[PDB]
Amino acid sequence: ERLEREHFWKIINAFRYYGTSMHERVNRTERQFRSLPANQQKLLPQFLLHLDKIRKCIDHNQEILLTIVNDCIHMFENKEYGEDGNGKIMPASTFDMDKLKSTLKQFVRDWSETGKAERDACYQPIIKEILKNFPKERWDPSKVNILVPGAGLGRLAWEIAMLGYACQGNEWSFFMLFSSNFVLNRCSEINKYKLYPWIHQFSNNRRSADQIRPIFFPDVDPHSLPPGSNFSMTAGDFQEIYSECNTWDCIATCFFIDTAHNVIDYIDTIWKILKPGGIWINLGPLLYHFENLANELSIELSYEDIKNVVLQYGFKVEVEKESVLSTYTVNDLSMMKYYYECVLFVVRKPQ
Amino acid sequence: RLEREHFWKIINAFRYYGTSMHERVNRTERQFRSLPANQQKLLPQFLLHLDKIRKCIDHNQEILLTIVNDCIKIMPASTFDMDKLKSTLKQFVRDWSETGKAERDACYQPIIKEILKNFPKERWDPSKVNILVPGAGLGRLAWEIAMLGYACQGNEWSFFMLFSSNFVLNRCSEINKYKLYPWIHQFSNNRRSADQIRPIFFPDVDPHSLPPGSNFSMTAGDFQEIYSECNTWDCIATCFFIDTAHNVIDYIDTIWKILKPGGIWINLGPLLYHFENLANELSIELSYEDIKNVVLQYGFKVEVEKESVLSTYTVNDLSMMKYYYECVLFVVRKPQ
Numbered sequence: 001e002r003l004e005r006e007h008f009w010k011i012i013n014a015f016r017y018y019g020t021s022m023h024e025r026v027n028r029t030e031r032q033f034r035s036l037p038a039n040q041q042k043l044l045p046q047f048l049l050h051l052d053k054i055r056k057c058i059d060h061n062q063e064i065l066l067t068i069v070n071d072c073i074h075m076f077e078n079k080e081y082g083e084d085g086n087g088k089i090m091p092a093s094t095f096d097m098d099k100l101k102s103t104l105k106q107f108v109r110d111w112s113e114t115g116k117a118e119r120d121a122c123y124q125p126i127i128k129e130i131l132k133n134f135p136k137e138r139w140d141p142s143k144v145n146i147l148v149p150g151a152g153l154g155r156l157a158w159e160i161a162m163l164g165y166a167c168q169g170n171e172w173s174f175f176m177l178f179s180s181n182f183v184l185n186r187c188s189e190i191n192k193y194k195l196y197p198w199i200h201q202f203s204n205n206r207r208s209a210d211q212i213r214p215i216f217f218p219d220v221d222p223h224s225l226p227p228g229s230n231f232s233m234t235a236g237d238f239q240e241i242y243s244e245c246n247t248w249d250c251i252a253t254c255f256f257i258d259t260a261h262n263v264i265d266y267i268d269t270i271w272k273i274l275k276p277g278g279i280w281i282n283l284g285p286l287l288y289h290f291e292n293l294a295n296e297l298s299i300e301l302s303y304e305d306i307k308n309v310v311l312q313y314g315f316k317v318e319v320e321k322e323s324v325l326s327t328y329t330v331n332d333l334s335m336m337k338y339y340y341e342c343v344l345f346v347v348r349k350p351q
Numbered sequence: 352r353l354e355r356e357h358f359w360k361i362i363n364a365f366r367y368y369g370t371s372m373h374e375r376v377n378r379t380e381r382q383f384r385s386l387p388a389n390q391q392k393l394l395p396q397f398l399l400h401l402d403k404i405r406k407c408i409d410h411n412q413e414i415l416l417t418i419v420n421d422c423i424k425i426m427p428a429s430t431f432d433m434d435k436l437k438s439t440l441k442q443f444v445r446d447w448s449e450t451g452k453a454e455r456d457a458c459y460q461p462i463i464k465e466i467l468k469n470f471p472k473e474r475w476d477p478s479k480v481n482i483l484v485p486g487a488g489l490g491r492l493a494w495e496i497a498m499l500g501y502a503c504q505g506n507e508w509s510f511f512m513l514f515s516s517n518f519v520l521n522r523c524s525e526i527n528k529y530k531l532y533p534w535i536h537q538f539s540n541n542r543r544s545a546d547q548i549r550p551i552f553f554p555d556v557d558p559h560s561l562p563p564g565s566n567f568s569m570t571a572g573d574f575q576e577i578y579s580e581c582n583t584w585d586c587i588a589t590c591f592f593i594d595t596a597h598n599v600i601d602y603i604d605t606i607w608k609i610l611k612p613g614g615i616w617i618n619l620g621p622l623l624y625h626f627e628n629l630a631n632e633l634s635i636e637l638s639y640e641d642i643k644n645v646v647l648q649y650g651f652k653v654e655v656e657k658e659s660v661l662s663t664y665t666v667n668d669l670s671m672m673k674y675y676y677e678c679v680l681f682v683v684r685k686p687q
């Protein structure tokens with residue numbers, strides 16, 4: 001696990017490098033603008049001032065990321081990771097800078113009022129299926145064990161625990177784990193924090209102000225879980241952490257199964273660790289994460305093939321809805337938006 | 352000259368399509384065969400389906416070869432050029448297939464309606480109205496404009512597009528004679544395995560059905576270099592085009608220059624700046640608000656402005672993931 005230590009400080013270092021990276025991007029824009037003919041520059045007399053506002057938004061974002069860094073460096077479970085790693089002050093990769101940008105957007109989806117419409121489209125259908133299958137009239141929710149793999153910043157798992165179910169989120173990415181630890185443990189005052197999740201988008205802006213607008217978080221107090229709640233989060237590969245068979249009443253995957261190198265392996269795990277009679281609720285598209293990465297296994301299945309594999313495992317299909325429309329960390333003011341026609345299904349492991 | 356080097360570079364890319372795509376399928380096949388036998392047995396049609404993909408690749412390569420030959424050793428083309436090739440196949444859906452009609456109706460019909468409103472027969476002899484369509488892609492919009500009787504010229508920079516528009520516009524008459532498989536490179540977000548290999552047919556109309564006395568033409572080259580004669584055009588119609596500029600202010604300058612006094616510029620599209628993420632390329636990314644302020648300072652008069660014109664671009668209607676654009680539509684007039 002010396003390589004996990006190496007990976008830990010690599011991610012810490014990426015968090016610390018955000019401002020350097022983004023300030024370079026803005027300096028390229030200023031350089032290019034300053035090389036235009038003077039008369040064209042005079043057509044845009046607020047352009048340089050707007051770059052200054054972007055730079056302030058960058059500094060603010062960097063301040064949020066250093067707060068997360070400060071939080072996770074001083075966590076007891078992270079003492080096994082060491083002093084400061086190498087004596088390396090190293091630049092971070094662009095691949096990690098892209099993950100940082102996505103992580104900032106994830107705050108919108110999971111912990112901002114701005115993301116409520118997205119959560120209503122993705123999380124509420126899952127929560128409703130849970131209420132349908134484990135209704136309060138017949139089930140003590142505190143004895144129903146629900147696992148949420150790839151929980152991201154944890155809002156879905158948290159919402160399930162708010163209803164009283166014994167809910168565990170699981171997440172492999174340090175970007176998400178550092179950030180959700182910060183939100184779930186430290187952000188105990190509604191909308192106290194702010195970030196600028198769209199400053200990286202220079203294209204498709206209707207108004208220049210849209211790029212620098214803030215989002216506030218958290219929209220709920222994460223510590224309003226009532227007494228008797230049972231909420232937890234685990235760190236690691238879903239496929240390695242969960243080895244006990246016949247354990248879970250429910251597994252809820254939301255925009256997750258297409259993260260697999262091999263989705264058949266996910267299906268195999270979910271079958272093994274569900275209790276007889278347990279259910280797997282899935283909602284999401286099929287954007288295979290490793291498809292366009294060299295030296296990475298990626299088995300890309302159509303939804304039709306996924307359902308055929310699920311049926312051959314012995315699962316029984318109880319709910320299937322195609323074309324469940326949603327966005328994912330959408331920028332509502334952008335002139336370009338991605339939409340997903342997700343499939344929702346509920347399948348049961350036979351008793 | 353180095354333009355003939357660039358020419359043969361694109362010819363070679365057309366000829367490398369099958370090689371590049373068969374290698375992609377090889378990686379999927381190798382990875383599937385790497386799986387444990389018990390997992391491969393769950394999917395007894397998987398390898399046969401790759402074989403259908405390979406047939407569709409071969410059929411696409413035949414089409415590309417008739418395009419290249421009806422335009423007149425194989426070296427590895429760049430990943431950058433194969434992506435442009437894949438996009439060109441998709442462009443056939445948008446411009447010359449019935450599949451693309453809903454897209455054309457959302458993007459092309461608003462432009463044509465503004466042309467009809469601004470050059471009505473009660474005022475204009477249409478055959479003397481000169482309309483320019485920069486970045487005409489495969490030519491459908493410019494062709495529709497010429498079908499109304501106006502003197503319309505399309506202009507296109509990309510050899511991928513020019514080779515293909517030449518094939519469609521000059522060697523196609525029989526409706527739906529040809530088919531392509533524009534979706535075979537999409538392995539993600541498929542509802543049904545059959546959706547990846549489904550065909551589209553083109554052309555949905557006969558391009559040689561232009562009326563008598565028509566005036567339709569296409570030029571090859573950089574819009575900003577080819578059009579130097581001032582005060583020439585009655586109308587310039589830009590559709591998903593102005594975000595292709597290194598510096599959109601230069602496009603605005605050219606449009607101002609070559610419009611006649613009283614002529615109009617019709618624009619519809621988003622602002623996805625082509626060079627934003629390309630290393631060592633100039634890219635001035637303006638908000639729409641800033642583009643409007645440049646247009647106002649040039650002296651254009653704003654006659655029409657609609658934001659949030661909703662459209663897709665070479666959408667795969669069966670895909671589980673789709674891109675939507677909230678386009679701006681405007682019509683501005685160079686004062687008389």
Ligand SMILES: C[S@@+](CC[C@H](N)C(=O)[O-])C[C@H]1O[C@@H](n2cnc3c(N)ncnc32)[C@H](O)[C@@H]1O
Pocket residue numbers: 109122149150151152153170171172173176236237238239254255256259260
């Ligand atoms: C597209 S995000 C979805 C996040 C969240 N479920 C939501 O809908 O907002 C998928 C998440 O799964 C995580 N992930 C991918 N593979 C994983 C694995 N093998 N084990 C645990 N988490 C994984 C990624 O880090 C990412 O946070």
Ligand SMILES: C[S@@+](CC[C@H](N)C(=O)[O-])C[C@H]1O[C@@H](n2cnc3c(N)ncnc32)[C@H](O)[C@@H]1O
Pocket residue numbers: 445458485486487488489506507508509512572573574575590591592595596
């Ligand atoms: C996004 S496509 C739009 C095609 C077509 N107008 C449509 O709406 O379907 C933009 C087109 O402009 C072309 N283009 C980019 N820069 C150009 C230039 N400077 N001169 C001429 N064409 C250009 C590209 O090759 C491409 O075909």
Ligand SMILES: [Ca+2]
Pocket residue numbers: 048052
């Ligand atoms: Ca300054």
Ligand SMILES: [Ca+2]
Pocket residue numbers: 188189221223
């Ligand atoms: Ca509190």
